[PDB]
Design a protein around this ligand. Structure first.
Ligand SMILES: O=c1c2cc(CS(=O)(=O)NCc3ccccn3)ccc2ccc2ncc(-c3cnn(C4CCNCC4)c3)cc12
Length: 302
């Protein structure tokens, strides 16, 4: 059975195994509420969990597990989704609590619990009803998280509202790193070995090369999701037809209640020339200026 699966750590890249050991959680310190599914990632389901800290205090966490354990390659990619987050320390980026792996079964990627859940379902919720200014503020928070990520030379590749979480203080955190890659000193990441077609930059669709500038494009799509309150992008355009649609200069259209200065920012994110797109630092500056000059009702701290 799957519960008897044994992972041979000798088969993985030593640097990965060392990184996993550096964030190891002993099995006696973790309780997985396996009967309480809270979400899903690219590799499996997410469950409620309880961690016991160094002083025996209970910490509410989220636990990702690997749904399919048939090959080492998938095990490697799953552990990497946890490992890429190891040194993350920013208010708008989800931190890694650790990784638990015993003799049998799935490795377990442990994360802080995010009270309000995913950003997409949050903004779609008729109760929540966030104001226009609250939405711009969430967009600003995401830009701050991405400025941090790009500074560490990591490329997200999957920035979408679905992949962001809100904690008890309504702090938005970029949460899923299932496709994120270290750019090292290359300033790009090319496909070797899922891809979000409707959030991808035109050049990534064409060449399968990813950069911070293609993350800027995805960010623009995220802003559009925020301003439409979680509407699906290009609903009348097929995935396979997106490349041509974008080649023709067509873009996501201005959401009904979106301020004109914020739509202009979105259009800058979708410039056909990646070098012409603003950086994350510039996006933080521009959005902060729009947020501070849109005088409307707002409830959260951004
Ligand atoms: O599940 C998660 C989670 C999920 C991901 C994957 S993703 O969702 O960012 N991408 C999605 C994805 C990735 C790849 C492929 C497809 N989809 C990444 C990190 C986390 C981390 C913590 C977390 N905390 C709370 C809740 C939670 C859940 N409900 N509530 C509350 C419970 C009570 N009512 C309101 C919500 C809180 C859910 C989660």
């Amino acid at each position: 059975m799957q519960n008897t699966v044994h992972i041979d750590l000798s088969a993985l890249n030593p640097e990965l195994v060392q990184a996993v050991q550096h964030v190891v959680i002993g099995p006696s310190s973790l309780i997985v509420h396996f009967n309480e599914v809270i979400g899903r990632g690219h590799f499996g389901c997410v469950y409620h969990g309880t961690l016991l800290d160094n002083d025996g205090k209970k910490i509410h966490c989220a636990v990702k597990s690997l749904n399919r354990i048939t090959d080492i390659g998938e095990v490697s990619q799953f552990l990497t989704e946890g490992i890429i987050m190891k040194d993350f320390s920013h208010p708008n980026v989800l931190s890694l609590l650790g990784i638990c792996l015993r003799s049998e079964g799935s490795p377990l990627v442990v994360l802080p619990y995010m009270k309000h859940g995913d950003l997409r379902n949050f903004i779609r919720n008729e109760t929540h009803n966030p104001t226009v200014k609250d939405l711009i503020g969430f967009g600003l928070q995401v830009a701050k998280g991405m400025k941090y990520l790009a500074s560490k030379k990591f490329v997200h590749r999957d920035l979408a509202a679905r992949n962001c979480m809100l904690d008890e203080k309504f702090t938005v955190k970029v949460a899923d790193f299932g496709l994120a890659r270290d750019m090292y000193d290359k300033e790009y990441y090319s496909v070797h070995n899922k891809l979000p077609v409707k959030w991808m930059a035109l050049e990534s669709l064409q060449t399968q090369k990813f950069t911070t500038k293609s993350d800027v494009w995805s960010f623009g799509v995220l802003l559009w999701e925020l301003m439409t309150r979680g509407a699906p992008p290009y609903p009348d355009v097929n995935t396979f037809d997106i490349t041509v649609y974008l080649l023709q200069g067509r873009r996501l259209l201005q959401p009904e209640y979106c301020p004109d200065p914020l739509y202009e920012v979105m259009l800058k994110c979708w410039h056909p020339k990646a070098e012409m797109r603003p950086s994350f630092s510039e996006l933080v500056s521009r959005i902060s200026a729009i947020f501070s000059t849109f005088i409307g009702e707002h409830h959260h701290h951004h």
